[PDB]
Structure 1
Amino acid sequence: MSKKISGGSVVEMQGDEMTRIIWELIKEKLIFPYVELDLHSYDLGIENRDATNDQVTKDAAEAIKKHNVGVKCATITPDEKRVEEFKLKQMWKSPNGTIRNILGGTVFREAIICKNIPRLVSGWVKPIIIGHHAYGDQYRATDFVVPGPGKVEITYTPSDGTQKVTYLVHNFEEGGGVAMGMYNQDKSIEDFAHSSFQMALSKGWPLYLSTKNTILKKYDGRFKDIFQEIYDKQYKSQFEAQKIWYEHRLIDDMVAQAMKSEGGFIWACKNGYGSLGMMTSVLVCPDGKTVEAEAAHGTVTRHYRMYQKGQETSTNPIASIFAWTRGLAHRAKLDNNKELAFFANALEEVSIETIEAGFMTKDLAACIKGLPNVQRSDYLNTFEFMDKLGENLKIKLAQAKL
């Protein structure tokens, strides 16, 4: 290679514990040799967040909002046990939450599938992109305890001083109970519509909506309605191009049609098996520019203690890798970077293809040969698996020089 690819503007977010070591190995051995980036790196490790009073995570938020691409390493969501581990000054909020609240958009999870790994239904040769709602949860759902008898009613009082409307969720004639309250603004449904519609074009796959409008009068209905409204006003001519179609089926048919399906569609369902190390979540924002990619697991603290105590460790990096490769593939779309485009997809193909050739870590090996029959020779540690990914990537990029 004459010159390294000109990446462009990407925001990088370092994490902590096991995945922090994976992260550097990934940059050092896979990304940096081949791509130069205008890198906006932030240190979202727990020590620094503690030291900067969580200010650094807010800066990351604002920087993805500007440069439209982010790739994030798994971070510790602390608790009471970890404020003794690091003597935190305060129980900080989740970094992942604080970016989803600031940046907005819709998370999309996808499991990466190798032809020689077990699966739930063995017909799913194409992966399934399941992305439900925003924020990690529809913000709150105020719920109380109704200790004794009395009416519980939910009221809507219009801001323009018009007639108030009460509904009566239940009158408790005798005995206790429990009560609940949800809601869903309208904008968050259009943001959900656009985000999910865009991923259908970005991936060239069909998009399905699933609801329970049969039981819920007009809560789940309002979803169906706004999608049809948006789907016929925009994106309908764009779907006709790339063969993609959209349709809304009932959730109970869709659950069985998933097993009936062969894979390769997007499923947005108004609400975890899978090696826990092959799943990559992507937050796609409503504008269709800014997008944060990251892995869907955690800091792998048990495998970090094996690293701390010097032990051998066999941790799986594919989930983190494909955070880089989705982020880079997105920037290559924005900048119309035809050469970063190919690099990203190539990187995705060695990971999957290096596993298909029998080179994998312990977790993947336990999926095939069962955990009680996994042998040292059936898997690689954490390093020499990256070493094998590295040289396979050098081998493949040299090939694709024509």
Structure 2
Amino acid sequence: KKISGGSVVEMQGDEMTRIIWELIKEKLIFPYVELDLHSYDLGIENRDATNDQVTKDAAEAIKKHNVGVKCATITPDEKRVEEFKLKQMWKSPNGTIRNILGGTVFREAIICKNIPRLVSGWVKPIIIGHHRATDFVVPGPGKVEITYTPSDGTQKVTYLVHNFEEGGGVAMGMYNQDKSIEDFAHSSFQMALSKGWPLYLSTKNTILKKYDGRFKDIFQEIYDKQYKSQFEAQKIWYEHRLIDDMVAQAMKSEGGFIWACKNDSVAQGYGSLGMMTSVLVCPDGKTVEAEAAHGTVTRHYRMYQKGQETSTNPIASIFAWTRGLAHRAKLDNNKELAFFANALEEVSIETIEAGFMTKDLAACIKGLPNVQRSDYLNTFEFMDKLGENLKIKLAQAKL
């Protein structure tokens, strides 16, 4: 019999990632793992047909069952509205899910030794996690003020942002709740423990002494109170850094740390965004949603619609599953599932490291103008190779 993987929430998506998603389930997951699968179709046509109710249900299912794996979906714009004759310009599914669940998005690369990187010294992953606008034009002279009116009726506070004495300009207001900062802290500490690396927070608290100082203070208070003992047990630490110092140190590091950032296209140089997953980590320590860091790869899908050959990287999508299942295994103390998830990840890394890869990675190594057809495998060929290697890997582990 297969591995009993338990309860997993699955979200089907759009275009090229939809094709790859089904191949991942068919060739890599279903042949080895049985799931109590809570499956939701977040394809654009179904979201339209259900008036986006399917997206809300999916979010609630993740809250209920703790483990979510999601395929990339189309975020509608005016162009998509015309393409699919949509009823409305539906909100980003990711945005709707994030609002219901809360949490912090962490991005982790899939490390392959033969794939060029920004700093050659980076041998371990650098897992980065990021935390309303209210801006307006100032047409002419006048005061911009920002006020705080306590809910308890005590005297309101008025700060002068700027008195425009001559000419116009622009002004802006921003905020951050302590609760959100607390969630951000908890998620970051939990992430550092689960992966087994040190955590760093970066802020500009020298300039924004009160705004960014709150982030520094809250992280320290929660660290010293709730996480310091557990960190020291694994030979791990937490320290605050200034953003300028943090980047300079990271560029001369070996990697292998969590970077909580207070504020994507840089990371695409590492092969592509096909080598980056995006995991939402909720502050409860229980709930996770995993997906690829890239979109639906529309350009590749158009070629697929015409019957032309495609070479789309399934790694990020594959690692959405493995990091989803790894969390599932951790929650249920499921040693068999834990091993399988690891095995699939290693198989994927090994296959690329042995010279079998999709065009994006071949282009990163050799340069796009220099890439020939013999340097890479198409989408189907690469999936077949992974499946063959997966079978061989699992047979070896049975000894």
The TM-score, its normalising length taken from structure 2, stands at 0.98
Q: 1 CA distance for matches of 2:339 and 2:22? A: 22
Answer whether contact 1:111 1:274 (CA < 8 A) is retained. no
Deviations 1:215-254 (A, max 9, x none): 0021000001011100011011100111111111111111
Q: 2 CA distance for matches of 1:47 and 1:306? A: 20
- Shift of the alpha carbon at 1:164? 0.7
Q: Does 1:227 align with 2:210?
A: no
- Shift of the alpha carbon at 1:110? 1.1
Aligned to 1:180, what secondary structure does the other structure show? Answer: strand
Q: 2 CA distance for matches of 1:274 and 1:60? A: 31
Answer whether contact 2:270 2:364 (CA < 8 A) is retained. no
Q: 2 CA distance for matches of 1:82 and 1:57? A: 18
Give the 5 Å matches for 1:121-200.
121-133=119-131, 140-200=132-192
Relative to structure 1, the CA distance from residue 349 to residue 273 in structure 2 (aligned partners, 3 Å threshold; closer, same or farther) is closer
Q: 2 CA distance for matches of 1:34 and 1:182? A: 49
Deviations 1:10-36 (A, max 9, x none): 000000100000000000000000000
Q: 2 CA distance for matches of 1:217 and 1:332? A: 42
Cα RMSD over matched residues? 0.8
Aligned to 2:313: 316
Answer whether contact 1:325 1:345 (CA < 8 A) is retained. yes
Identity %: 100
- Shift of the alpha carbon at 1:294? 0.3
- Shift of the alpha carbon at 1:273? 5.8
- Shift of the alpha carbon at 1:348? 0.6
Answer whether contact 1:151 1:172 (CA < 8 A) is retained. yes
Q: 2 CA distance for matches of 1:167 and 1:62? A: 41
5+ residue gaps, structure 2, are: 264-268
Deviations 1:328-372 (A, max 9, x none): 000000000011000001111011110000000000000011000
Q: 2 CA distance for matches of 1:182 and 1:277? A: 34
Q: 2 CA distance for matches of 1:332 and 1:36? A: 13
Q: Which has the higher helix share?
A: 2
Relative to structure 1, the CA distance from residue 274 to residue 362 in structure 2 (aligned partners, 3 Å threshold; closer, same or farther) is closer
- Shift of the alpha carbon at 1:261? 0.8
The TM-score, its normalising length taken from structure 1, stands at 0.97
Q: 2 CA distance for matches of 1:356 and 1:274? A: 13
Q: 2 CA distance for matches of 1:255 and 1:367? A: 24
Give the 5 Å matches for 1:68-83.
68-83=66-81
Q: 2 CA distance for matches of 1:377 and 1:274? A: 18
Candidates 11, 14, 38, aligned match of 2:36: 38
Q: 2 CA distance for matches of 1:14 and 1:71? A: 9
Aligned to 1:299, what secondary structure does the other structure show? Answer: coil
Runs of 4+ residues deviating >2 angstroms: none
- Shift of the alpha carbon at 1:156? 0.3
Aligned to 2:27: 29
Answer whether contact 1:293 1:323 (CA < 8 A) is retained. yes
Q: 1 CA distance for matches of 2:246 and 2:252? A: 9
Deviations 1:265-316 (A, max 9, x none): 0000101765121110000001010100000110101000111001011100
- Tell me the number of residue pairs that the alignment of Structure 1 and Structure 2 aligns: 394
Answer whether contact 2:271 2:361 (CA < 8 A) is retained. no
Aligned to 1:136: none
Answer whether contact 2:59 2:100 (CA < 8 A) is retained. yes
Deviations 1:32-61 (A, max 9, x none): 000000000000000000000000000000
Aligned to 2:385, what secondary structure does the other structure show? Answer: helix
- Shift of the alpha carbon at 1:387? 0.2
